[PDB]
Amino acid sequence: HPHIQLLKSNRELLVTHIRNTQCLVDNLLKNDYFSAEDAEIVCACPTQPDKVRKILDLVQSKGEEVSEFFLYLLQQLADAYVDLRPWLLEIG
Amino acid sequence: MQIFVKTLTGKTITLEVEPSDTIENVKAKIQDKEGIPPDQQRLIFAGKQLEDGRTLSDYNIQKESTLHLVLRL
């Protein structure tokens, strides 16, 4: 389980640096990895880091395949618009 | 930034606010979306009821927070 363990080790790093749980829950919903209930359970969490913790709990439970995708989801979401960062922060 | 509000009919609306926005402002945006008089709304953040005077910043309500909406007549 190199992916479940990969999410178990760097759990603190993820809770610290993830700033949008919405685009994560949505994508998980659209791939049938997340039930509509799982979404509402995550949304129920008062704070943002709590939502990050709850997502990580559900992901590491559903298996290894789901985890591996969650790694891929984070990768292609951070790399997607990264080169627009200098210009974007330059404005506002 | 965005906050979430669970109107306990099950669903959860998603709002667009600022840390500077007052509680009345949040109620106003809720009124626009759900059609509820602000003097019937009570916003709950982690067990505590928010006063109509203070702001979101004064409550440490940061991005992607979730508040609860209850009625009062």
Residue numbers in the entry:
A (entry chain A): 17 to 108
B (entry chain C): 1 to 73
The authors write:
NOD1 is an innate immune receptor that recognizes γ-D-glutamyl-meso-diaminopimelic acid (iE-DAP), a dipeptide present in peptidoglycan of bacteria, and activates inflammation and autophagy in response to bacterial infection. NOD1 is composed of three domains: an N-terminal Caspase Recruitment Domain (CARD), a central nucleotide-binding oligomerization domain and a C-terminal ligand-binding domain. The N-terminal CARD of NOD1 has been shown to coordinate interactions with its various effectors. Recently, however, Ub has been found to bind the CARDs of the innate immune receptors NOD1, NOD2, RIG-1 and MDA5 and regulate their activity.
Here we report the crystal structure of a complex of NOD1 CARD and Ub. The asymmetric unit of the crystal structure contains one NOD1 CARD and one Ub, while symmetry-related molecules reveal that both NOD1 CARD and Ub form homodimers. As observed in two previous crystal structures, NOD1 CARD formed a homodimer that involved swapping of the sixth helix of each subunit. Two Ubs were found in the unit cell as a homodimer in a conformation nearly identical to the structure of covalently linked Lys48 poly-Ub despite the lack of any covalent bonds enforcing a particular conformation. Additionally, the Ub dimer in our structure demonstrates the chelation of a multivalent anion by the sidechains of Arg42 and Arg72 in a fashion also observed for Lys48 linked poly-Ub. In our structure, NOD1 binds a different surface encompassing about 500 Å2 that is centered on Phe4. The Ub interface on NOD1 CARD is localized primarily to an apical region of the molecule where the second, third and fourth helices converge. The interaction is anchored in large part by the α1/α2 loop region and the fourth helix of NOD1 CARD, with the sidechains of Asn36, Thr37 and Gln64 hydrogen bonding with the sidechain of Glu64 from Ub. First, Glu56 of NOD1 CARD is involved in a salt bridge with Lys6 of Ub, which is the only salt bridge found at the NOD1 CARD:Ub interface. Subsequent refinement of the model with a dimethyl-As moiety on Cys59 resulted in a good fit with the observed electron density, and we found no evidence that either of the other two cysteine sidechains (Cys39 or Cys61) were similarly modified.
